[PDB]
Design a protein around this ligand. Structure first.
Ligand code: HEM
Ligand code: HEM
Ligand code: ELA
Ligand code: ELA
Lengths: 428, 428
């Protein structure tokens, strides 16, 4: 057997956190390989593999077990106990069916319209404002859109507090399972939002709130599993937050996207015109190019052959997400921001995997991917078409690839926002 | 000479106010004529004529003088001193050109989008509410839309106070020029709104506010007459309010229209589907059918022949608006609400005259007619398509034809408003 190259050390976890999104690509480049191993999270042998073929293996349910692979501290803050992400087999398929039942053309068209119109009518507010932090403005607006879409009635103060607590949770994968300053805060934030959603679910069940059929709150509150039992109210709250929290996490991509409209002159006009699905292509390129999800865990269910190496059964195994999205072979000029790369993209489930790969119904692939694209398309068309603005000069617009979680350092601060309308009025 | 039939009495003004929109049709029917006279407003001989031919005469600038014909108390409350309505000749044509310069396809498309999106994002508010008075909710929303369209920046409190003061002004034609309880209040309301708009115009001129090119505030603030002089700031305020006040008066038609969707089952579905311009046709039928403008004044500039009668030069002359809109010859089954009557309407400038007849550029015909149609189409599509609601049972939904000003007595009160969205979700 060819020996899998080793990143040496009893535990290399702190090297991963020091290099962040660059950890995996750095080792791929140093060993000149698609696969290597290290010790992490308490000394445990961890294989990492990368590329489209790796992703096909990783989402082959006959080869890879996903249950019990997420680190417990990340379950405790990001996903919640018993979350859909932690399930497998029939239980997972059934649960996933509930999430995907929401994602009809019509329900997504409504999201599209909510997003479009909420931005549109936020224009006066942004004009008022001296500076607008896109990351922060968008997390609030997306809580309002996502709640309304989900059928959750909330006051302004509730929206704002939920958004802050969700923000904390979204960031909480940054220590990839280790103890950190903020772990207890992230738990407390989770407790707060869980309780807010649980109380609404309890009211739904008792007949005190009547959200419409087809909204996530209604459907989750009434859903029975294959033996005819409701999710307990706390579990239901957890999985309901697994709709609305990652919806608000699109703020990171909103922020990245307005950065891209600034960094790559010419893009705004192309998104504005939106010919042959350019807005879509721009959004796909924002999701490919900018860092968010580093990598994902699972375990080899059987011995697996890859690149001439053997991955023994029970090996703890990680799919590289970031490095796959930036791989030289797979994407020509991967470090170039170039939406038109998507004109000749074949739609593979295994290359463009910023939100997971594989199948929506039988794999853990993100339920909200279609939603994310739609929210992003309307958000980017808004910034390119419906307002003019200046990128504030005194800010840090960089993205530190060496730090989880991925974001624009400043948040992407704009100013002098004015509605861009063609009135076509000829003064008399 | 055939003698013009007389409604006898030294002064019949109080009979006009007692019969309101029915005064003119009642006399047309009693004398079996298209023309009659009475004494009104201090004993002055007043000829009234009715029908499409009357309207063609009334808007023939060679035959009719309009200057100095509006009663001074109505100038003082409704239009403002020196308002465009009070001008004539070259001065009027020039001034009218300013108003009509705003009415480009593109500027009207923006209005369309503002209106559509402001209703859309008002849905949550109306859901919250126990009852919604359509007349009152729409006057507020239209102040917000009309101000934004006009480039006028206002706080919520300013919008609300302007709407109340504008409401008072819109009602102030109801005594057709006579003294009334509320005359002094209507003056004070006018003073308030004039001052609010003047202050913004002064700021525009001084460089302190910078509204966009093409908005009414910008264009009115900078407009020079044919000798190169700005409107004095007070006159500019008056004419600027002659954009935004009648825009908010569309609330009366919003209210009437939701009444029509209740009174005529089947209309909602037709407006919803909007095939072969049904929404447009429904709006035209709301404007034809429901009372607002009773009649309009002018003066014969020369002797005129009509229906075999002579209208002597200098006769004070009134065009019947309401009775023309309800004339048996001109509209088959005029008392029927039947939008499809507009499929075979030839677009005459002289029959469908709820907002005046004749030419937009050379006559006093309403500058905002195109705007009104657009605002109404989006408002009616919203009520028919985007919400479901119940018509509150305990209200007076009648329209008292015997009382200026025309409106639904209750305002049209609805309740249990819910967003109407097709989610098309099949519960699993
Ligand atoms: C910036 C936004 C988002 C990112 C980065 C993201 C990413 C991901 C990733 C990496 C996973 C795990 C895939 C795996 O384990 O194989 C996942 C799962 C999931 N996401 Fe997304 N997501 C985002 C937005 C959304 C949205 C908007 C929704 C709305 C419903 C959503 C719903 C879910 C759900 C339910 C799962 C779990 C599904 C399963 O395990 O079968 N996500 N997401
Ligand atoms: C319910 C709404 C409306 C009604 C009932 C209405 C009706 C009328 C009537 C009857 C006149 C006088 C016609 C004449 O003297 O021959 C007029 C003039 C005018 N209206 Fe409208 N109007 C309404 C809305 C609007 C709107 C939305 C605007 C927006 C700009 C507007 C702007 C004007 C202007 C500037 C004039 C005077 C033009 C001239 O004398 O040349 N109106 N309107
Ligand atoms: C180099 C490998 C290091 C060792 C092991 C890493 C363990 C894995 C922890 C992963 C972080 C989880 C992913 C973050 C976002 C997940 C998807 C979501 O937000 O819905
Ligand atoms: C029967 C005739 C009675 C005598 C004389 C009537 C004098 C005319 C007064 C008319 C009221 C004015 C019209 C009201 C709305 C006008 C257009 C606007 O709101 O922009």
């Amino acid at each position: 057997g060819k020996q899998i190259p080793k990143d040496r050390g009893l535990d290399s976890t702190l090297k991963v956190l020091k290099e962040g999104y660059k950890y995996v690509p750095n080792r791929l480049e140093k060993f000149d390989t698609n696969i290597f191993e290290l010790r992490a999270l308490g000394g445990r042998r961890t294989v990492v593999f990368s590329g489209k073929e790796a992703a096909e293996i990783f989402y082959n349910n006959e080869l890879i077990e996903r249950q019990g692979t997420l680190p417990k501290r990340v379950v405790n803050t990001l996903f919640g106990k018993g979350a859909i992400h932690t399930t497998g087999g029939k239980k997972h398929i059934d649960r996933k069916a509930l999430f995907m039942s929401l994602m009809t053309e019509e329900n997504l068209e409504y999201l599209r319209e909510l997003t479009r119109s909420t931005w549109f009518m936020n224009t006066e507010r942004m004009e008022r404002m001296d500076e607008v932090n896109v990351y922060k403005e968008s997390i609030i607006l997306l809580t309002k859109v996502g709640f309304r879409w989900a059928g959750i009635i909330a006051s302004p103060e509730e929206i704002e507090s939920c958004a802050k607590d969700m923000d904390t949770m979204i960031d909480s994968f940054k220590n990839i399972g280790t103890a950190f300053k903020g772990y207890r805060e992230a738990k407390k934030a989770r407790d707060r939002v869980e309780t807010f959603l649980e109380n609404q679910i309890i009211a739904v069940r008792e007949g005190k709130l009547t959200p419409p059929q087809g909204t996530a709150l209604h459907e989750f509150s009434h859903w029975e599993d294959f033996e005819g039992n409701l999710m307990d109210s706390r579990l239901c709250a957890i999985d309901l937050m697994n709709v609305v929290r990652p919806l608000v996490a699109i703020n990171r991509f909103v922020s990245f996207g307005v950065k891209a409209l600034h960094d790559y002159p010419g893009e705004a006009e192309k998104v504005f015109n939106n010919e042959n699905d350019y807005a879509y292509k721009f959004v796909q390129e924002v999701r490919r190019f900018y860092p968010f999800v580093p990598f994902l865990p699972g375990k080899a269910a059987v011995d697996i052959e890859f690149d001439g190496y053997k991955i023994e059964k029970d090996t703890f195994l990680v799919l590289d997400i970031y490095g796959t999205l930036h791989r030289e072979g797979l994407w020509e000029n991967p470090e170039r921001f170039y939406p038109n790369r998507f004109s000749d993209w074949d739609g593979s489930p295994f290359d463009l995997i910023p939100q997971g790969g594989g199948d929506y119904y039988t794999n853990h692939r993100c339920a909200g991917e279609w939603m994310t694209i739609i929210i992003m398309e309307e958000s980017m068309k808004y910034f390119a078409r419906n307002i003019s603005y200046d990128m504030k000069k005194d800010q840090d617009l960089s993205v530190n690839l060496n730090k989880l979680p991925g974001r624009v350092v400043s948040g992407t601060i704009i100013e002098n926002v004015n509605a861009l309308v063609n009135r076509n009025v000829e003064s008399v």
